[PDB]
């Protein structure tokens, strides 16, 4: 019976390929061909971040556009006004091993998770003037590799155990858990009406997940290798993938299929993150040659490279402005690019 | 100066918490990195007994002096690649393997040898690009129950190419050479190899013995001597 | 809760030395700069001492200067302000408060309830002041309490430092609105901050039985602290 159902699966499979194809007129290269080209995009650094002693894993900006949250291996978790560089939290961290870091919307929060399984989350705005770890949430079987918050209550996180996982915090118990992955979850994206996210896997594959619902809406399968990074197009009717072969993809939901590749042929590093603009045309990724290229969203053409750093460009973020890009690497020092 | 009294007590407060950072930083620096990895059944726990005694579990103790972290990451269910990268820069590499594995079949289920996944797994993380220059403290435990075993039990079952005889010393060297031999960063890195019991007691002193010729190497590496 | 206990107030002949004792719980004490407020027996608030985190910078008032010391014992959690050659002027009401700063913090959160020192018989600052000493209120009606600043108050990078205190019959003073906008943490949404250069005015709707007491306007942009004359709030 199992080999009658493999094949009903294969059958399905060649179906979706079919009507994908069906769907398929025209190339994002061949509408994006007459538009004028963005041109080279030139950024400076104008702040350096300072006060990292290991190799930072992630970041992330937050509303305000002004604040940022910054997580390194040394077993510290640093808020940066990045306007003046000045440290206005710097919480020491239970376990050292994190590699995501979350800030809460509202700015009241702050979470973090790694190599403990356990995500952490942080009452910045606390009476007696200290940070104090908030909750701990418990559960997932493998380490915690994204972790964004859908508001003070809520929060989706995805861990190395192949599943996603939607927690209420002030109960600390999973919502919702979100299974189908057959690798480990690198990173997941909320669409900004937080009603849909997307979750990029070990399995070349990237899958659609509704968060009231609990079910997968759709997988996208184009890579070659392990997907490391992903994010929302800024209108949340598509997304892109950064993965180990280096190749970035951009999917559209509607469409149901992959839109374009970014590629050259003397990159051949993996992208370890990938972040958009505001206005969406230029899709930011981090290698691991050092740098940072800015592609070209809808001409796939490189626009210009953020070379300022010593080690791997571990993490990156945007402001909700689209004011500023942060590059947090293994150098230990954060970077913001305007 | 252009910042107000609250933009000055905000950067007071900036440089007390970079002055902790710092501090912080200074007294994790002088600690001890040590990586435990093996696999099943190989022999982890009674090392960290050891270390007591004189997710990710971490274990914390004190020799001579200097203090040793120990990562033991164990139970950690996913692919080694997306996060062995986290643990370059540990001043060593604990290795444990259980010689009466030598002859015990079942892998994981795999029905394949558990010597042979164990010689897998220490050639992938020894040849592994991020530990090219990290010394491997190689643990060779059970050596009681091992010493039982080859008598009645041939070495020949795990390695077929075996013509010495079955005795404890002639096979133990064997399979010291065979897992030394997996070694292809000859040049940048040592293996310290240590044949330990149950119910050794000098376990302790051979890692600290060991971290210190990692760091007479070091320290000969950063002066260049060689 | 958080609380701070004033001690070592008492009757002092003039030129005589005292040492007030301010001690803190349910708060981390080393992380928060400390205020010494004197409240003379009928006139408002005026700022006296203050020491930093860590002690690293420790600022007086012009009156005080010379004579008074601020200091903090963190690991005990107490603040010490030793003041020798007494004058009959200081003979007042002691607040230790409490005030952290970064980005988005309130400072002059909390207040403690202050002690008694009874002793036996300028220019180049900000003089902030409140014209209207005080205004009948029916309660459940709308008014608005003015203020205005010798120099303005808005400096270069947005930040408009001006702070709203409450002073309730027998009760220490309570921080309404901090940087002449945002609302301090637990008072309720009925007072509102506006204002803009160096007039500033503060607005309270359904006003309520508990809104009675003396307004204070107070400043933070240079650091010789000035208050306001206050405005006293009384019904009908």
């Known amino acids: 019976e199992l080999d009658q159902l493999r094949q009903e699966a294969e059958q399905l499979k060649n179906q979706i390929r079919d009507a994908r194809k069906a769907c398929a007129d025209a190339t994002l290269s061949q509408i994006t061909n007459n538009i004028d080209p963005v041109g080279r995009i030139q950024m400076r650094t104008r702040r350096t971040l300072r006060g990292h002693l290991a190799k930072i894993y992630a970041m992330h900006w937050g509303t305000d556009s002004r604040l940022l949250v910054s997580a390194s291996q040394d077993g510290k978790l640093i808020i940066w006004d990045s306007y003046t560089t000045n440290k206005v939290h710097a919480i020491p961290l239970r376990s050292s091993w994190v590699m995501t870091c979350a800030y809460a919307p509202s700015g009241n929060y702050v979470a973090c998770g790694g190599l403990d399984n356990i995500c952490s989350i942080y009452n910045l705005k606390t009476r007696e003037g200290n940070v104090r770890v908030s909750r701990e949430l418990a559960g997932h079987t493998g380490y915690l590799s994204c972790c964004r918050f859908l508001d003070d209550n809520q929060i989706v996180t995805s861990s190395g155990d192949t599943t996603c996982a939607l927690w209420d915090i002030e109960t600390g118990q999973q919502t919702t858990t979100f299974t189908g992955h057959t690798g480990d979850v690198m990173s997941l994206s909320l669409a900004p009406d937080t009603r849909l996210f997307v979750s990029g896997a070990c399995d070349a594959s990237a899958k659609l997940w509704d968060v009231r619902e609990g079910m997968c809406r759709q997988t996208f399968t184009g890579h070659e290798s392990d997907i490391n990074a992903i994010c929302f197009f800024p209108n949340g009717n598509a997304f892109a993938t950064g993965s180990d072969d280096a190749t970035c993809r951009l999917f559209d939901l509607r469409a149901d299929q992959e839109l374009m590749t970014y590629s050259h042929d003397n990159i051949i590093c993996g992208i370890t993150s990938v972040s958009f603009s505001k206005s969406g045309r230029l899709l930011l990724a981090g290698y691991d040659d050092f740098n940072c290229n800015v592609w070209d969203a809808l001409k796939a053409d490189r626009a210009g490279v953020l070379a300022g750093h010593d080690n791997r460009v571990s993490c990156l973020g945007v402001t909700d402005d689209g004011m500023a890009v942060a590059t947090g690497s293994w150098d230990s020092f954060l970077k913001i690019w305007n | 100066c252009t910042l107000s009294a609250e933009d000055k007590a905000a950067v007071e407060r900036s440089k007390m918490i970079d002055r902790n950072l710092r501090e912080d930083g200074e007294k994790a620096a002088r600690e001890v990195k040590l990586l435990l990895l093996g696999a099943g059944e190989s022999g982890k726990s009674t090392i960290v007994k050891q270390m007591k005694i004189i997710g990710i579990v971490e274990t914390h103790f004190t020799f001579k002096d200097l203090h040793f972290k120990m990562f033991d990451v164990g139970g950690q269910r996913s692919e080694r690649k997306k996060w062995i990268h986290c643990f370059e820069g540990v001043t060593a590499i604990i290795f444990c393997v259980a010689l009466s594995d030598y002859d015990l079949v079942l892998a994981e289920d795999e029905e394949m040898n558990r010597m042979h996944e164990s010689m897998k797994l220490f050639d992938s993380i020894c040849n592994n690009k991020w530990f090219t220059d990290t010394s491997i403290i190689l643990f060779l435990n059970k050596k009681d129950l091992f010493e039982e075993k080859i008598k009645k039990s041939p070495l020949t079952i795990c390695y077929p190419e075996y013509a010495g005889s079955n005795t404890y010393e002639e096979a133990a060297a064997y399979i010291q050479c065979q897992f030394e031999d997996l070694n292809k960063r000859k040049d940048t890195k040592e293996i310290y190899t240590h044949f330990t019991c149950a119910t050794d007691t000098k376990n302790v002193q051979f890692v600290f013995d060991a971290v210190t010729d990692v760091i007479i190497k070091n320290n000969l590496k950063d002066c260049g001597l060689f | 809760d958080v609380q701070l206990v004033e001690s070592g107030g008492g009757l002092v002949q003039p030129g005589g030395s005292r040492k007030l004792s301010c001690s803190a719980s349910?708060?981390?004490?080393?992380?928060?700069?400390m205020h010494w407020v004197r409240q003379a027996p009928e006139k408002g608030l005026e700022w006296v001492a203050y020491i930093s985190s860590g002690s690293g910078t420790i600022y007086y008032a012009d009156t005080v200067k010379g004579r008074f010391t601020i200091s903090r014992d963190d690991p005990k959690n107490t603040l010490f302000l030793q003041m020798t050659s007494l004058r009959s002027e200081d003979t007042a009401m002691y607040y230790c408060?409490?005030?952290?700063?970064?980005?988005?913090?309130?400072?002059?959160?909390?207040w403690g309830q202050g002690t008694t020192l009874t002793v036996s018989s300028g220019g180049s600052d900000i003089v902030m002041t409140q014209a209207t000493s005080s205004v009948p209120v029916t309660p459940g009606e709308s008014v608005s309490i003015s203020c205005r600043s010798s120099k303005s108050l808005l400096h270069s990078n947005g930040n408009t430092y001006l702070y709203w205190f409450l002073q309730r019959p027998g009760q220490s003073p309570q921080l309404l609105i901090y940087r002449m906008s945002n609302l301090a943490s637990g008072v309720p949404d009925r007072f509102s901050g506006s204002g803009s250069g160096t007039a500033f005015t503060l607005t309270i709707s359904r006003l309520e039985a508990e809104d009675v007491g003396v307004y204070y306007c107070?400043?933070?942009?240079?650091?010789?602290?000035?208050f306001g004359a206050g405005t006293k709030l009384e019904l009908k």
């Open positions: 107070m400043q933070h942009l240079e650091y010789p602290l000035t």
């Open positions: 408060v409490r005030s952290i700063y970064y980005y988005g913090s309130s400072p002059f959160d909390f």
């Open positions: 349910g708060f981390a004490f080393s992380s928060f700069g």
